[PDB]
Design a protein around this ligand. Structure first.
Ligand SMILES: Cn1cc(-n2cnc3c(NCc4nc5cc(Cl)c(Cl)cc5[nH]4)nc(N4CCOCC4)nc32)cn1
Lengths: 248, 826, 332
């Protein structure tokens, strides 16, 4: 019916980028660069948050089938955001995205677009649609983070601090391969799980089963704690690596 | 009964080992490079290497180590050959005459013992107290380094652990201590023992055994400052010393297997590592020193420096240069820079040493109708794969055509002014479900390209499952121009299809000249391939067209043109196809009495079959009946590597034990049993692994008939890059040249005092026989280098066949003319 | 009737000769395929042309001895075929006879001499138990093969072992002491009693040869390799100890005892030089290579050993033969 868009962590060592000589650190860097590029460009254009993530997920899935060396990262990222705009019904003209790209890219980085930046992007749309198998509908952990928080009852200010901090973790998780590792529902629970430990919150108390120590089960079934700890470990790797500190 | 003559045209070029030390003098830093049976002595300078001496040894150099005992001015050299000849050598220079002195010599072969799996290992104690040899399973041989042990006598200490992977003499131990990784059914472990020359037995080792990686490869003796050892594996590098245990597991080294190592800093702070993909790593040893009372290892680090040639041995010299000794490609001198280049690599190549590497196939072609002839070889493997064009140069001129993939078989088609080359590249299962190549090669960078659209195997109910990270071989047929050597076209065969044989010829009454490839469907579940294709191509107007396909039930290991019919070997079957007027192949007759019909040669209606076992078979196509007929077979079992037809009665073959032999039909006897018995009449230990025999010669060919002492010309290429020549002699010339060998052997002093007859003696693990029917031409051509007093010793009492019908004694100058005429065959 | 009861009446025309495979005891061995059944069979020729003594007596022995022997580990002579029978007059027939054996896949010689095969401990147990079960059967029937060599040891790809050539086979009787030919086993497998000139020998001559094969499966190299009988006795003395009246009381009776003296009076170094062999097999090898044939173990005693007593023939662990695409050139 629908294609599978999820791999295992061990499979990332065999991406077309890895197999062409790129080291694991460079592909992860190229992914964060492309993710933040799609994030910053669409933010400058005033785009909805679902449109940003949809293009980022298109971007992440694209370089599971192709190599970063053969397709320029910033040329591909612009095409994903352009397609994501028409997909999520928040469209922008291709010339408007190119204009924003020149603002945020230096002379070296913008050279990927070649002599005709618009044509290099419009051309890549055919390969993008074929690579993503025309599976345009993509859901994101944001709607699940909100669907689960409404079922929480208690201190409104404590729950609101939990949501924004988890929402920050979802924005940061876009820079990672987590979008490909796990379904969006599990990611929304893991960011609740991480923000609960940092904020010292007992999330089980706000649920309909205040005693259910596995508070996550009432939201997403069949989720071991090993997965939640694994996702939390990946998100916090960005904070310790970069210059940003944990929200807390 | 048969008489042959073998000379070396090109010395072995593949570097089998390389070491750094102080052999010539205590001040100079020498780089002793070891190729097969050859020892090169160089002097390291600021500009590169300065040659000083090159010597030949009567044995395949297996172990080569430099040591300096107490009281010696410069380092001495210890060498153990493949035939277990051990010796200790010293450098002596009297002005311009440089000679190598054999201080000690002996044979350390045991009468009873199972040869180990990981090969001969040679280690020397840091205190130079003993030489440690691992020659057999469960046995550790110790040669005590006493000043009077000139015969190199040795005793064996029983070893509990039978299956050992690698062993080294440890540093920083009170008593001489060995550290080894062994493999038992409980995995692999590392253990230690103390060697006692007084007791001649093992004592308990310093630190205990621990369970290590299942693919533990090498042991690295960390020097005195850090102490202990480092164990290299496939995914983890571990350091063990006393109670200290360290384990690093970087994700980069999992991609390719590490095979070699070398120390940069003598204190052991920095180490070199190399992969199968040419990647170069650096192993860093962090120090924790506090008034020197600790100097323990804080942590270990590995960093990727760049890409070198696939090296068998690495050695760091001085001024930042490293010699990359390669067996699969060209050896190089590389510069290690502190600065990364524009690509992020810290390695820059200084010089390139041409290495013919593995010569898998080769063909002699007179491209320029000069009468000289050129040899185009398939050389190298993986990234070092290339084509080499060799010609006589008025030394030798070799042109390299890099392919960046493994070449397989080569054939020339003058009708298209191009070559046919079978090649294979390695791609890895990516995340998209398909495969992605690591590097571009000739099959991908072809001008035009095509892929076989055959459905001959249809679904063959075999949709094997592929997991991510599994290597796959992609076989292609390359069309290469004869002038530019540009990849004109590349035909990619079916999935999981290996290209094994390649021929260019016309068939039947069809005037078009075709390229024919024999293939096989290779799956890991199959012990012997049960599917295959014989496909016929026609190269016309720069594009290859699929003419016809024939399905076979096995592997097409070899094909050859037989009187306009195609003779092909399919697994145990040797089949003859006919080229019908419908442009399709049709089976005529079969032969089945084989195990694995590998190498094929034909001459008229005669057929020489080279099987995996037992040896060589003669098949004759009988046109009256239309079926094959066995004439005679060599009944002594041999593992064949290449066969060749010398004449209608002599046959030449090469076995996996580095031995050449010559069979002959028992004349035309009256008994049916005598005729059917191919008798081995020639035996000779070559020392090289022959892959391809080829008729031809690179010397100028004079259509004028000249009564030359040699008749015929057969060239062969080897794994170590050595190219030789085989030719037949008359009985008068054989006895004349053979008598010179016995005179030359008594005169010439060999390195390590190795008997020449012992070296050239036919040698397998089970039988050892003296050489017969072969004249070591490398020994005969050395007559032009011995001093004049030694020439008179050779020509003394020697009776020649001067003129016509007279047995007059030869002058020494008469022998110089004979050898100089034999030097003109190459 | 039928069922291979009537012999000599079938002709060799029913067999198509594939080719010659090797040299046998008295004549060379050829391989063929039956036209009717399609089975691969091994044939061996008997001339019968020598009107000196007519039918060869060494062939009569192999025909007489082999028709009595039936075992899973012994090559069974299938039938006997003849050449074309000339005319109505039995006087004009100069045709020869052919012995029809069962054809096996490989020979131990070709497998070991090529160096391709590898024998694990479980393979040697499957090998030696079948080898000793067949030898025990023939020794119980009082027959001596006297030519135990790797060329007469045949193997199928299933793992079944069979002994082949019985042309040099004779009958043994302990009561009747009849002199036989002193030199009969290949020098590398000849027992020390035969080197010293024993003409009336025991069935332990095959036990010594098979003992040299047992050790040959662990080293893949023959133990004692010499070109002369005295040099062969020296290699045996360097390992098993010099033949002396202390360990061999009946050595003095042997004629060449004073003639063929070893270099030294060596001590037994068999367990020392074979320390890498498993303990179960070293005890078996030590007894099989015992100098005194009266102290040498029998075929039944080898089957009652920790190395072979509990081995099951249902497994038949076949010896590893190399495959292909991972061999030659740089492949693996
Ligand atoms: C008395 N007797 C013999 C058999 N007997 C059955 N099977 C074989 C067999 N099968 C392997 C084999 N080796 C071959 C070599 C060649 Cl060159 C060819 Cl073409 C085909 C081959 N097949 N070998 C032999 N040997 C006889 C003597 O010397 C060497 C081997 N005897 C065999 C049955 N009774």
């Amino acid at each position: 019916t629908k294609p599978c868009w999820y791999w295992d962590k061990k499979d990332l060592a065999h991406t077309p980028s890895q197999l062409e000589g790129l080291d694991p650190a460079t592909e992860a860097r190229y992914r964060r660069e492309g993710a933040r590029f799609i994030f910053d460009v669409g933010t400058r254009l005033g785009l909805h948050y679902d449109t940003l993530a949809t293009g980022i997920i298109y971007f992440h899935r694209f370089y599971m089938f192709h190599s970063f060396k053969q397709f320029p990262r910033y040329v591909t990222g612009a095409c994903c955001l352009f397609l994501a705009g028409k997909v999520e019904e928040t469209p922008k003209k291709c010339k408007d995205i190119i204009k924003t790209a020149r603002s945020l890219l230096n002379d070296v980085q913008f050279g990927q677009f070649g002599d005709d930046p618009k044509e290099e992007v419009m051309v890549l749309e055919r390969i993008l649609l074929q690579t993503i198998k025309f599976d345009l509908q993509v859901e994101h952990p944001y709607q699940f983070l909100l669907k689960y928080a409404k079922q929480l009852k208690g201190d409104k200010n404590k729950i609101q601090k939990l949501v924004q901090m988890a929402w920050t973790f979802v924005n940061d998780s876009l820079c990672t391969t987590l979008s490909l590792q796990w379904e969006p529902e599990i990611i929304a629970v893991a960011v609740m799980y991480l923000a609960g430990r940092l904020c010292k919150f007992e999330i089980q108390e706000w649920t309909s089963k205040p005693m259910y120590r596995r508070w996550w089960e009432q939201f997403v079934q069949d989720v071991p704690v090993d997965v939640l700890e694994d996702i939390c470990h990946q998100i916090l790797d960005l904070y310790s690596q970069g210059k940003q500190q944990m929200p807390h | 009964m048969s008489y042959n003559y073998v000379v070396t045209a090109q010395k072995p070029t593949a570097v089998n080992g390389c070491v750094t030390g102080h052999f010539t003098s205590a001040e100079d830093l020498n780089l002793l490079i070891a190729k097969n049976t050859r020892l090169e002595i160089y002097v390291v300078t600021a500009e590169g290497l300065r040659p000083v001496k090159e010597v030949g040894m009567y044995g395949k150099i297996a172990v080569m180590e430099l040591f300096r005992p107490k009281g010696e001015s410069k380092d001495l050299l210890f060498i153990l050959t493949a035939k277990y000849n051990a010796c200790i050598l010293e450098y002596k220079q009297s002005g311009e005459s440089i000679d190598i002195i054999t201080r000690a010599h002996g044979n350390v072969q045991d009468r009873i013992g199972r040869p180990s799996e990981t090969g001969i290992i040679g280690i020397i104690d840091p205190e130079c107290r003993m030489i440690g040899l691992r020659l057999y399973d469960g046995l550790f041989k110790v040669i005590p380094l006493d000043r009077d042990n000139k015969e190199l006598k040795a005793f064996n200490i029983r070893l509990e652990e039978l299956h050992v992977i690698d062993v080294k003499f440890l540093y920083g131990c009170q008593a001489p201590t060995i550290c080894f990784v062994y493999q038992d059914p409980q995995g692999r472990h590392v253990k230690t023992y103390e060697v006692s020359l007084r007791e001649k037995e093992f004592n308990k080792g310093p630190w205990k055994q621990e369970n290590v990686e299942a693919e533990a490869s090498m042991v690295i003796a960390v020097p005195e400052p850090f102490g202990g050892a480092i164990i290299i594996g496939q995914e983890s590098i571990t350091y063990h010393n006393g109670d200290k245990y360290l384990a690093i597991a970087p994700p980069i080294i999992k991609q390719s297997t590490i095979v070699c190592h070398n120390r940069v800093d003598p204190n052991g702070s920095r180490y070199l590592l190399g992969d199968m993909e040419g990647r170069l790593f650096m192993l860093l040893l962090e120090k924790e020193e506090q008034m020197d009372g600790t100097v323990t290892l804080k942590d270990l680090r590995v960093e990727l420096l760049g890409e070198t040639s696939i090296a068998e041995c690495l050695t760091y010299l001085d001024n930042g240069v490293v010699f990359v000794g390669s067996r699969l490609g060209d050896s190089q001198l590389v510069k290690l820079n502190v600065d990364s280049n524009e690509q992020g690599s810290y390695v820059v190549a200084m010089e390139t040493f041409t290495n013919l590497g593995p010569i898998v196939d080769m063909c002699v072609v007179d491209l320029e109708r000069q009468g000289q002839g050129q040899l185009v070889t398939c050389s190298g493997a993986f990234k070092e794969g290339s084509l080499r064009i060799i010609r006589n140069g008025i030394k030798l001129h070799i042109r390299t055509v890099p392919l960046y993939e493994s070449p397989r078989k080569i054939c020339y088609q003058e009708v298209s002014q191009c070559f046919g080359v079978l090649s294979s590249r390695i791609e890895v299962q990516d995340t998209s479900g398909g495969t992605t190549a690591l590097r571009p090669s000739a099959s991908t960078q072809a001008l035009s390209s095509s892929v076989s659209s055959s459905k001959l195997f249809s679904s063959s109910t075999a949709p094997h499952e592929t997991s991510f990270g599994e290597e796959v071989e992609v076989h292609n047929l390359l069309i290469i121009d004869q002038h530019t050597f540009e990849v004109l076209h590349a035909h990619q065969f079916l999935q999981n299809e290996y290209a094994l044989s390649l021929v260019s010829c016309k068939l039947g009454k069809d005037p078009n000249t075709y390229f024919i490839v024999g293939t096989a469907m290779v799956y890991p579940e199959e012990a012997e391939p049960k599917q295959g294709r014989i496909v016929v191509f026609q190269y016309s107007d720069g594009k290859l067209q699929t003419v016809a396909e024939k399905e076979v039930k096995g592997a097409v290991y070899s094909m050859v043109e037989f009187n306009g019919k195609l003779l092909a070997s399919i697994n145990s079957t040797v089949r003859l196809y006919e080229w019908t007027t419908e442009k399709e192949l049709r089976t005529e007759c079969n032969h089945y009495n084989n195990i694995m019909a590998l190498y094929l040669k034909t001459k008229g209606d005669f057929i020489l079959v080279g099987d995996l076992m037992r040896s060589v078979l003669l098949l004759a196509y009988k046109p009256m009946e239309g079926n094959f007929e066995e004439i005679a077979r060599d009944f002594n079992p041999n593992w064949m590597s290449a066969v060749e037809i010398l004449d209608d009665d002599n046959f030449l073959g090469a076995e996996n034990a580095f031995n050449l032999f010559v069979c002959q039909k028992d004349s035309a006897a009256t008994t049916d049993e005598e005729r059917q018995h191919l008798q081995e009449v020639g035996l000779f230990h070559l020392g090289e692994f022959v892959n391809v025999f080829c008729h031809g010669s690179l010397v100028m060919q004079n259509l004028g008939e000249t009564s030359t002492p040699t008749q015929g010309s057969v060239l062969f290429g080897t794994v170590n890059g050595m190219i030789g020549l085989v030719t037949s002699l008359s009985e008068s010339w054989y006895n004349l040249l053979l008598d010179m060998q016995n005179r030359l052997n008594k005169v010439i002093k060999s390195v390590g005092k190795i008997e020449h007859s012992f070296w050239r003696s036919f040698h397998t693990e089970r039988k050892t026989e003296p050489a017969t029917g072969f004249i070591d031409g490398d020994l005969i051509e050395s007559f032009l280098d011995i001093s004049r007093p030694k020439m008179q010793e050779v020509v003394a009492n020697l009776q020649y066949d001067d003129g016509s019908g007279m047995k007059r004694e030869a002058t020494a100058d008469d022998l110089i003319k004979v050898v100089e005429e034999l030097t003109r065959i190459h | 009737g039928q069922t291979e009861s009537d012999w000599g009446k079938r002709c060799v025309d029913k067999f198509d000769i594939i080719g010659i495979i090797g040299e046998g005891t008295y004549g060379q061995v050829y391989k063929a395929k039956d036209k009717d059944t399609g089975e691969l069979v091994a044939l061996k020729k008997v001339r019968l042309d020598n009107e000196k003594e007519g039918f060869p007596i060494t062939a009569i022995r192999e025909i007489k001895i082999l028709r009595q022997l039936i075992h899973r580990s012994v090559v069974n002579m299938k039938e006997i075929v003849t050449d074309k029978q000339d005319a109505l007059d039995f006087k004009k027939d100069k045709g020869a006879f052919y012995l029809v054996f069962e054809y096996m896949d490989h020979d131990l010689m070709g497998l070991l001499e090529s160096g391709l095969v590898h024998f694990s401990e479980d393979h040697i147990k499957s090998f030696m138990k079948q080898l000793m079960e067949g030898l025990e059967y023939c020794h119980k029937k009082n027959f001596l093969h006297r030519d135990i060599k790797c060329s007469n040891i045949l193997l199928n790809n299933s793992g079944q072992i069979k002994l082949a050539d019985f042309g040099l086979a004779r009958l043994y009787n302990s009561e009747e002491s009849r002199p036989y030919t002193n030199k009969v086993i290949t020098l590398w497998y000849r027992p020390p009693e035969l080197l010293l000139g024993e003409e009336r020998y025991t069935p332990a001559i095959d036990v010594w040869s098979c003992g040299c094969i047992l050790g040959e499966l662990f080293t893949k190299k023959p133990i004692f390799q010499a070109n002369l009988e005295l040099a062969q006795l020296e290699l045996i003395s360097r390992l098993c100890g010099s033949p002396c009246p202390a360990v061999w009381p009946d050595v003095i009776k042997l004629p060449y005892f004073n003639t063929m003296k070893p270099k030294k009076q060596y001590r037994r170094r068999l367990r020392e030089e074979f320390s890498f062999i498993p303990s179960a097999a070293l005890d078996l090898l030590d007894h099989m290579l015992t100098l005194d044939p009266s102290k040498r173990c029998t075929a039944e005693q080898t089957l009652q050993s920790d190395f072979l007593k509990d081995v099951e023939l249902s497994k038949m662990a076949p010896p590893d033969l190399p495959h292909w695409q991972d061999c030659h050139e740089l492949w693996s």
